[PDB]
Design an enzyme around this catalytic site. Sequence first.
Site, short mmCIF file in Angstrom:
data_model
loop_
_atom_site.label_atom_id
_atom_site.label_comp_id
_atom_site.label_asym_id
_atom_site.label_seq_id
_atom_site.Cartn_x
_atom_site.Cartn_y
_atom_site.Cartn_z
N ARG A 171 -9.42 9.40 1.08
CA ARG A 171 -10.24 8.18 1.23
C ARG A 171 -10.36 7.27 -0.01
NH1 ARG A 171 -12.94 11.71 4.90
NH2 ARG A 171 -14.63 12.28 3.46
N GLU A 172 -10.61 7.87 -1.19
CA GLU A 172 -10.74 7.21 -2.50
C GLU A 172 -9.53 6.32 -2.84
OE1 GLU A 172 -10.61 10.78 -2.31
OE2 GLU A 172 -12.78 11.02 -2.04
#
Length: 132
Positions: free
Chosen positions: A73-74
């Site tokens: 996600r990051e």
Amino acid sequence: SNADFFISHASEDKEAFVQDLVAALRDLGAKIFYDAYTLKVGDSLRRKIDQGLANSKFGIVVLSEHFFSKQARELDGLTAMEIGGQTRILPIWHKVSYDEVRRFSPSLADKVALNTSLKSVEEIAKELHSLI
């Protein structure tokens, strides 16, 4: 830049759809490479994309369920822009839903792309061949 297109894909798709897309595009007289562009878990999309763009005019990324499973996600904003934010890269949605594409990457879900549920491999090869 000898070839017209290079096709990056997950191993699971290589015989089934990559193989037909390759055959259909060659049938129209286009130069394509698919042997060295299979993606394995742990590979760098960026490096494979740069490698392919050094030997071809354009690149194709087959966005299937397998491609997403193999690929955090990051870093979604960084990796999806490598697939969708490049003028010489064209993604193809294969057997995926809008919600799946959005679940893996919201950024990718709205980017312009070809879709196998809307056209036959032959229609896709003819349309890809026109851009050349």
